[model samples]
Target: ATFEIVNRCSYTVWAAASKGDAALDAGGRQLNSGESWTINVEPGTKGGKIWARTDCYFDDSGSGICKTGDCGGLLRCKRFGRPPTTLAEFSLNQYGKDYIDISNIKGFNVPMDFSPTTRGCRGVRCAADIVGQCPAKLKAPGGGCNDACTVFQTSEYCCTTGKCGPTEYSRFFKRLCPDAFSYVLDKPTTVTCPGSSNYRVTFCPTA
Candidate 1:
C-alpha cells in the first residue's frame, strides 16, 4: 500500500510512521508547509501508523525533542511517538479489507484528513482546533491537547479492563470530530476500505 503524507499546516511538521519495530522513513521526515512525502507499505502490514510532530529542533545527529509528538527525542523513531497528536492508523490486507481510522485518543495537535484514493470509500477528517479550545485540565505541556485517559489515567477514561463508555471529555472530542475515535472502545469510528487501497494523510487539512 502507498501512503502519502502531506503537510498543509501553516507551520513546519515532522511526519512519522511505524509498523512493529521497523521505523518507516527512518522513523521521521521533516515537512515544511505544503510539502509531502510518499511511503510504500509492505503487504499485510499491521498496527501501522503515521502522525505529525511539531515545534521540533533536531541537532546534527537528528537528536532533539518535538514540543508535541516526541518519539524518545530521536528523529528516527524506533517506537510510536508520545501523543497529543492526531493518528492515522492502518491494518492492510486484513481478510481482504484494509482497516483504517483517525484517532484522537491521545488528543490532538493538528487537524488531519485520512482517506483512500480508490474504491470510493469513505475518508475521515478531523480539522478542529482542539489545541486552542482544549479544556484547561486536558491541556498538554506545550501546544497540544490531552485526552482524558492521558490526563486522568483512570478506567473511566483509560478503559484498562472491561468495556468503557464515553464521558464528558470524550464527548468533547467526539462533538468536534465525529469521524475520529475520541476514546478507546469507539468502534463506529473505524472503517474498512477495499484491500490494496492507497491512502493519503493530510495534516492541517482544510476539510
Candidate 2:
C-alpha cells in the first residue's frame, strides 16, 4: 500500500516509508509537489514511519517539500536499523551540521577523497638547469628550489661564501634557477611545495 505525502509543513520533505522493520526497505521513491502514487507491500507487513532529510543542495520554502536522504540528491538514506518510531519530522533547521553524521545510526558508509591535482599545486615541469637558476625569491619561503641543480648545466652557478651566484648562460636555465637547487623524485622530476591551504595526500589505487 502506497501512502500520499500530504505536505502539512512548509519545507520540502524528502519522505520515505518502509514496509517492514528494516528502515532501508521503507525508503520513498521520488515524489513531486502535490503528487501521489501507490506502492505495493505485503498484506501483513506493518506500517512504517516516514523520514525526511536535507543537505547543502535543497532547502524548504514552507510551500513545497524537498527530497530527503538519497531520494533528494547524491547522499544515501540514513538507515535507522528499525523503522522510525514516529512520522519523521524535519525542517531546514533539521539539516544541521551533524545531519550528515551517521555513526549514531546504522547505515552503509561511503568513502571519499579529494583529487591530487586539486591539492593546490600548479602544473608540473622538468627539473632542468633552467629550473635551478630560479630567483631566490621565487623559491619556497624556506630558501629551497623545486628543481635540482644538476638537471641543467647551462644555468649552473657557483656556491660562493655560502650564497649562490648567477652564471653567464643565456638559456632559460639561468633565468629559471638563480640560486638553490631541488631534489629528485621517482615520479616527475618537478617539485611542489605545500600551499597555504591544508591538503591531504593519499596514494592512488593500483589496479
Q: Could you list the CA RMSD of all candidates, in the order they appear?
A: 1.3, 24.7
Whose lDDT is greatest here?
A: 1
Q: Looking at model 2, which ten-residue stretch has the lowest summed lDDT?
A: 97-106
TM-score against native, each model: 0.96, 0.26
Cα error of candidate 1 at position 28, Å: 0.8
- Superposed Cα RMSD, model 2: 24.7
Task: Indicate the TM-score of model 1.
Answer: 0.96
Q: For residues 1-207, what per-residue lDDT tens digits would candidate 1 score against the true structure? A: 888889999899999988748887567899999998898888688998899999999999999999988988888776787879789989999999899999998899899999998884899999987888888999998879999988888988998897799999999999899999988888677888998999999998883
Q: How many clashes (backbone atoms < 3 Å, residues ≥3 apart in a chain or on different chains) does model 2 have?
A: 19
lDDT of 2 by residue, 90-172 (tens): 11112221001101011111111111233434322122332134444323232222222322422333232344443332223
Model-by-model lDDT, in order?
Answer: 0.88, 0.27
**Stretches > 4 Å off in candidate 1:** none
